[PDB]
Amino acid sequence: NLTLNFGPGVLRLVMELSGEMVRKCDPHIGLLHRGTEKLIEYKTYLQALPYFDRLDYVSMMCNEQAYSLAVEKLLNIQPPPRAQWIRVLFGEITRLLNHIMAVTTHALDIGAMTPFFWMFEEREKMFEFYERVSGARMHAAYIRPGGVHQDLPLGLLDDIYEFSKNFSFRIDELEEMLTNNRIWRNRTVDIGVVTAEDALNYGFSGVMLRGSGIQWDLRKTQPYDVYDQVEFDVPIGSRGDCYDRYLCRVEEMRQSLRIISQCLNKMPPGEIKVDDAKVSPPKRAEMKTSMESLIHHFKLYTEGYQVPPGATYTAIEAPKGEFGVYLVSDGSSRPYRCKIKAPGFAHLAGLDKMSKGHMLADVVAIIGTQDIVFGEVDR
Amino acid sequence: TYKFVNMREPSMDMKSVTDRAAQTLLWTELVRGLGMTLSYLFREPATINYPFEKGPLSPRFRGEHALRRYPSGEERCIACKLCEAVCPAQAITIEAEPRADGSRRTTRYDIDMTKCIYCGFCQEACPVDAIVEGPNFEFSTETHEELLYNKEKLLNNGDKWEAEIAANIQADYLYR
Amino acid sequence: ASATRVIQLLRNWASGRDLQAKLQLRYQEISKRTQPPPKLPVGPSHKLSNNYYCTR
């Protein structure tokens, strides 16, 4: 029963082995702790928005949406319908990016490594959509607490439709290479089995719940934007192993394609940010021609908007599970407290339970199926 | 509504059992995966020939910063210090004083490119379109010091890129 | 794509699908990089009257 330290995303893992089996596995975190929650207190809400892209850098617009929803709830305002549809459309696109990344990285860690390139081509195309709308490929800062920053370019919906009508073949090729493979099945089936009661008590969320047979989804039970206006199915597992969660992620990719099609078909006209110049900055022409617009632009970009005092906990169904923000405001233009709840924290906490009586090579598979990105874990 | 992903019961008749045994013994799915890889081998790769071919971009792209100026030749910056106040990373340092003719102008305008996060807040907080985030992205450096831009470097960047900077601004200013 | 017929049949047989129906490389079917000017309609609170701020 020897103890070994797998040292330096990047992770340190101290584990005891009795031969081939794993006795105890303790993960050490803090290698990517930068102190985001403390730096937020020294910035205004708009200045604190970009931190959430760095939070979970595989799913960025989802973090933006969570923070924007929290600030909107505190502000007692709502965005225009077109902004909500853009948020939902982009959120679905981001979910695809996150699921592609997770599945391909898990396969590459196992050793497949071909679907990684096959689907990173599509990830590059998605980066372009992110780039066309906001000028940034990854750290977009597109979604703001008033809606979105800018309207879509005139040729974006057609390109999104053209891209999204050929993605099903990419998913089919991924499933062909992975789903029915006997080596992949032997690597994943009956690995890291977690019961429904343990998954609930251990604070798991997202696929880790849905993989165990629990019928829970925040987009269905507690819709936030335009979700109650789009129809989609929720994949549910039956064994709680890695294979069931992989199948759930693939089916979630397909349902994301479904929601993207619905959002493209049902796009409404109108403005893209709330018509409240005391919260959302006015247009440049209005700023350069109107006195009130100039005053409000000055005050919004220098001091910011004051949020009424109060504490809220806003949670959304991010691609990695329930992503939440507990925001406490004292009435000023700077948040008093911003606690971030990331599903990776609870998942990595339960890793030790989920890796009981498994081989050393099984720990890599379990970590891959947890969908762990340490930016959100460490914050 | 919800779906089941792994709720299929395999058939237990002789034909299905024989088919599964044949799959196990002859490796049909492995051959199918090999055929998929072979089919993917015979199609055109997606690689572009950098640096002779460049990836597509858009007018909204954020790159290396620049300071623009009016057509008459006077710099647009008026030392309002909005970009400094809105910078999330505190990468902008501004010092100003009245000029020889009494115009409100800057004496120091520094951007620390190693602190900047390229969020574009500075170019959208500017009321006179003075500071812009240009479209250049190939400006790597061999030393840390040369990434600490001062007013002269930013003005040189503006004079160098003004053509396509103004073209992009003209193309995109109706969305702002 | 610029592929010969025999290679196309080989790929379609090996994969099991019709590749040329849904290609993964973008061609002229994409939108142009130069677009007409937009108009971007104003929001709902752009009235000249009955628009006091204390009510909204």
Binding site: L152, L157, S168 | - | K39
Partner: peptide, 29 residues
């Protein structure tokens, strides 16, 4: 004067988008 012009889907909407899994059987007993 000029009329409102922004990104909207074309009249009649977009075409059907395939999302169902398509895993065929090559065929041999």
């Amino acid at each position: 004067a000029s009329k409102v012009k922004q990104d909207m889907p074309p009249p009649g909407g977009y075409g059907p988008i395939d999302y169902k899994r398509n895993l065929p059987r090559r065929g041999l007993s």
